[model samples]
Target: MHHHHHHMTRQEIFQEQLAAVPEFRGLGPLFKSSPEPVALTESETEYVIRCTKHTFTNHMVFQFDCTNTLNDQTLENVTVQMEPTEAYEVLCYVPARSLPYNQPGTCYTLVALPKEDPTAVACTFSCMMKFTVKDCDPTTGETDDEGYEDEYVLEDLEVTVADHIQKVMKLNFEAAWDEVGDEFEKEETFTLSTIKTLEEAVGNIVKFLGMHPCERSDKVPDNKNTHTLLLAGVFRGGHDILVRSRLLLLDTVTMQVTARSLEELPVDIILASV
Candidate 1:
């Protein structure tokens, strides 16, 4: 057998672009069709469930409740200690309160966010909450029935990036850098003192730019170097001008990102099309 390669036509190329980011292609109509958030119980230890579709950033508001099926005494001086993985960080803890002998209370509120970047990618934030429900005076840090504690591994509050596939596909490097570097006839390229990888930086750009990736876009090296990519999109009149990106400096040590791009059209012209 010989070579049987046939180049796609303009319509085919555009169609491919459409398929590349199908979710965003339908962005004008994409709705929050994810399942509704409902009550979830963890360890039978109790509390609030957030209606946040189980995904959170900055802060997670979940319901809180505890049971004394064992007829245990009322719990007071309740303080929650939260522990997150290296990928996450806790800004505030669920306040110190009390759990009734045979009742529930309001939700446990905690503020948190990714340890790394913005609300960019879909990440499984591993978190552990230790509920300290020992009897004590709230005004003072004194305890009587010390060590009356319960821990939860977030099973009942299990969460994730529901739009994982959609979010992942829309990530484009060129669009990534354009948002990071682009004014008009003037182009500004800078070295970012960051710890994120090239692709990760690009993905951040993808989040910024709602454009579709091009055919030549890819990871070029042995998964350790720079790779250039392009992304195109539709405007009211027709397809917009091509936007492309060069490679980024990917270094695990002292990770500093350096990238470049050219403005094929003026800033006003480009913005008008969108």
Candidate 2:
């Protein structure tokens, strides 16, 4: 039998992150508008495609609304396809197939990060929509066959290391911290090479790890050169991650970053991100 080790290798972390399944939140709609709403041409038989994007650290969700505004034609069997990019891999998608004239067709797609470091922060993907338009005469029951395919190249598909970090209350944060324990925890000190003040460090830390500021700890007290920041967020696979930062501002700001989580890889990721 082989002896078990406590620490995991880089390859092990990568494999674990890749193997983790994405869990989406059941929250209300937010960021529900796209810049490329009208991707199709504006002709007599015009169509509109409205997309809503929700980006997380390792996963993303896209909701699409398609509408057909044709006077005499009925759009049948609408299909939406997304090609994989260097930064994203299409996990699953539900396409609205029974499309009708003057009615909205809805669909949702799931995308995930396949590699450790993304090739680019802002990437583009090719979206192809195909549908069948039919012009039928009610009296004679005759129909004209016309199938149309349009290629819309959507640009600026933004990717983030950790984007959907949410703030938690102090009470909730403490409860979660005790619940998670310190089995998978990491502590490291990092030098903020260019940061000057403790307050500035707090702001930068939020953006750095994209974690929620627990108990409003991000607000630095007046005339305080040292502070503690409590951060928390839900990572991929629905694991809770908590962070504690002991910051001291001097000629150069030095931060003691400590992170704890139920899973080990996320704690390492959060620490490395800080």
What is the C-alpha lDDT profile of model 2 across 1-274, one tens digit per residue? 9998699754345334333423344322222122233343344446676665554555666656787665566666665566755557787766667556668887666777556654233345567666666776545646677666443333333434454344345556778788999998789999987888888889887876667788879899898889999988776556788999999988879989888888887677676556
Candidate 2 global lDDT: 0.65
lDDT of each model, Cα atoms only? Answer: 0.41, 0.65
lDDT of 1 by residue, 156-229 (tens): 33333332112223245455455546433332344546635666656654444444556546444565556665
Model 1 residue 82 distance off true place after TM-score fit, in angstroms: 3.7
> How do all models score by TM-score?
0.33, 0.59
**Any runs in candidate 2 off by more than 4 Å, and if so which?**
1-61, 67-80, 83-88, 98-102, 111-144, 161-167, 172-178, 207-210, 251-253
Which pairs of residues have clashing backbones in candidate 2? none
Which of the numbered candidates is closest to the native, going by highest TM-score?
2
- Give the Cα-based TM-score of candidate 2 against the true structure: 0.59
Model 1 has an lDDT value of 0.41
